[PDB]
Write a protein that binds this ligand. Structure first.
Ligand SMILES: Nc1nc2c(ncn2[C@@H]2O[C@H](COP(=O)(O)OP(=O)(O)OP(=O)(O)O)[C@@H](O)[C@H]2O)c(=O)[nH]1
Ligand SMILES: Nc1nc2c(ncn2[C@@H]2O[C@H](COP(=O)(O)OP(=O)(O)O)[C@@H](O)[C@H]2O)c(=O)[nH]1
Ligand SMILES: [Mg+2]
Lengths: 284, 300
């Protein structure tokens, strides 16, 4: 029940419903043209700003943003008054319709004025972070992963547990994922290749979608993801992807070589120490 | 000495013929089809499917000007030797009557030149209609298409590049063109029963079209074959782009296990199990061994 709390905001047609649909109700981007199950407590949108961790203001960059930029300044100016520990996030959204010249121009511009408008009100000590997002890209997932990692006080502990696990288990990279959202709340200390994240997100999709079709039990339904959810994917360059259930919200996805995976037994035994430790972290 | 089979892909400009062909046979994603140029006259494609079948795909530009040549100076070249006509319709067309007039004029040429052609009608871009309207609008378009198809039979599907309905339709089309397809089905029902699987799907390797299946206990999702095609095809494209080629997958729940692996040089297999007293080794040894017994068949 003590999840991180995020509020999405933005003018109509900015793309809020489209972001919500794609990330948290696991639905395709194209079908958003007609519109309790995650580690994250998220809501579209002064008691509300009291107990929230982060506000994501969205902007349509296929559209003029002058009006957009002004509600932004006012919306954040308000929130800061009530709770100045809140983090302020800005989804320069719909950049899949631009060319790269126009994306960089637009970001330089929105970043410039947004930060100018904050100087004028003497709100010096109010950080804005910016992001280029798209329901048609993985940018929305990376942006949410970055937003959520800021609200987990236990992240140093999580990064350390993954480091001990992978270093002792022959593993190149580990991602602690929120399964519905495909957001990563932690990874080991090795640098993150966003192509690696993206492939791991696409693995979660195949595992969950194949699970939703098979083994739901003989009645209409049980649950696709349970304590025995596991997958092994072999790629022709001898890469192995390995997903194991950690909690009802958390799956572990591991990248390693067939050569380390020869030692699955050790991986499997160390995994159960890592899983218990993660249970202790979150008093589950 | 592989069966060569002529497929006319026809319909008006922008209806989405080249998009379909590009997603099924050429590893495009829906988003990429935005960048396709109008086809000029016919774009010829040779698809090696399983080594016993070759698909001679005729992608015909549907510019009025191109159509008129097909109906006259190119009439014999186009409409002779046709196994299949796949005719595409834009659900969103403003020219329904003009659309039907170009369809019926193709049906005539097909009646006069290749009158045993299997005819398919694809009611396409269904993603542009509201969900609660799609079944309604397709049934009506279907009813008209079957009636206006005169003495010829037609099989209709509602398709979109943005979901699994496109694999439903192209699976059905290709299924009817695989030579000894009834044999394949028996050989796989055999294999399935020996290995005591709830379900086995067999896929052509490059397209991930379902080419055979076998189910034990009747399942609830009758659309699940196209969904699996789509889910796996997508993931196979994320692999090659982001890392390297998909080889194999093992997935499990407290209620099931599935195994997706290369089968023959030209196929993938998926095996669904609900964990009786089956040591995982027994199943993998069966998959491994049954290869040689399917590795024959598609010779020439
Ligand atoms: N919404 C939607 N757009 C689609 C669909 N299929 C194709 N399109 C788009 O329609 C446009 C035209 O598609 P093409 O495949 O070039 O059309 P074509 O029928 O080959 O046209 P010609 O070569 O002139 O005969 C492209 O932008 C496609 O992305 C679909 O199912 N839904
Ligand atoms: N091209 C593109 N369109 C988007 C994106 N996000 C949303 N949209 C579209 O823009 C509109 C915005 O939808 P909506 O979520 O209702 O904005 P909201 O009114 O704040 O809920 C819809 O047509 C969506 O298809 C995006 O990243 N790219
Ligand atoms: Mg074309």
């Amino acid at each position: 029940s003590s999840k991180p709390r995020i509020l999405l905001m933005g003018l109509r047609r900015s793309g809020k419903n489209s972001i919500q649909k794609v990330v948290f109700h696991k639905m395709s981007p194209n079908e958003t043209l007609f519109l309790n199950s995650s580690f994250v407590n998220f809501q579209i949108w002064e008691m509300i700003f009291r107990g929230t961790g982060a506000l994501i203001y969205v902007i349509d960059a296929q559209d003029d943003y002058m009006e957009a930029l002004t509600r932004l300044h006012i919306t954040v100016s308000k929130a800061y008054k009530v709770n100045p520990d809140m983090n302020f996030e800005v989804f320069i959204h719909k950049v899949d319709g631009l060319s790269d010249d126009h994306k960089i121009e637009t970001q330089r511009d929105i970043h410039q004025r947004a930060n100018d408008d904050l100087a004028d009100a003497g709100l010096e000590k109010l950080h804005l972070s910016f992001y280029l997002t798209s329901i048609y890209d993985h940018s929305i997932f990376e942006a949410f992963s970055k937003v959520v990692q800021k609200l987990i006080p236990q992240l140093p502990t999580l990064e350390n547990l993954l480091n001990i696990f992978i270093s002792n288990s022959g593993i190149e990279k580990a991602f602690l994922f929120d399964v519905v959202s495909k957001i990563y709340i932690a990874t080991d200390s090795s640098p993150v290749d966003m192509q690696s994240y993206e492939l791991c997100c696409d693995m979660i999709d195949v595992v969950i979608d194949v699970s939703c079709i098979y083994g739901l039990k003989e009645d209409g339904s049980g649950s696709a993801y349970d304590k025995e959810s596991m997958a092994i994917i072999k790629l022709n360059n001898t890469t192995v992807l390995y997903l194991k259930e950690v909690t009802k919200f958390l799956a572990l996805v591991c990248i390693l070589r067939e050569e380390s995976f020869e030692r699955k037994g050790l991986i499997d035994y160390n995994f159960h120490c890592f899983r218990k430790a993660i249970h202790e972290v979150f008093e589950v | 000495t592989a069966m060569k089979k002529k497929v006319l892909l026809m319909g008006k400009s922008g209806s989405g013929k080249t998009s379909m062909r590009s997603i099924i046979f050429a590893n495009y994603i829906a988003r990429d089809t935005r960048r396709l140029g109008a086809t000029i006259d016919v774009e010829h494609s040779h698809v090696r499917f399983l080594g016993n079948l070759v698909l001679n795909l005729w992608d015909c530009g549907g510019l009025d000007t191109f159509m008129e040549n097909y109906f006259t100076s190119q009439r014999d070249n186009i409409f002779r030797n046709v196994e299949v006509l796949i005719y595409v319709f834009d659900v969103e067309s403003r020219e329904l009557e003009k659309d039907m007039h170009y369809y019926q004029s193709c049906l005539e040429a097909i009646l006069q030149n290749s009158p045993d052609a299997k005819i398919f009608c694809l009611v396409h871009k269904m993603d542009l209609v509201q969900e609660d309207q799609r079944d309604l609008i397709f049934k009506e378009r279907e009813e008209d298409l079957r009636r206006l198809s005169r003495p010829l039979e037609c099989a209709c599907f509602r398709t979109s590049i943005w979901d699994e309905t496109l694999y439903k339709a192209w699976s059905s089309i290709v299924y009817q063109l695989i030579p000894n397809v009834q044999q394949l089905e028996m050989n796989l029902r055999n294999f399935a029963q020996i290995i005591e699987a709830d379900e086995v799907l067999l896929f052509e390797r490059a397209t991930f079209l379902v080419i055979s299946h076998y189910q034990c206990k009747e399942q609830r999702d009758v659309h699940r074959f196209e969904k699996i095609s789509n889910i796996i095809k997508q993931f196979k494209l994320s692999c090659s782009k982001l890392a390297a080629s998909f080889q194999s997958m093992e997935v499990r729940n407290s209620n099931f296990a599935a195994f997706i692996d290369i089968f023959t040089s030209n196929t993938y297999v998926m095996v669904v199990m609900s964990d009786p007293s089956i040591p995982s080794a027994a199943t993998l040894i069966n998959i491994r061994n049954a290869r040689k017994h399917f590795e024959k068949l598609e010779r020439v």
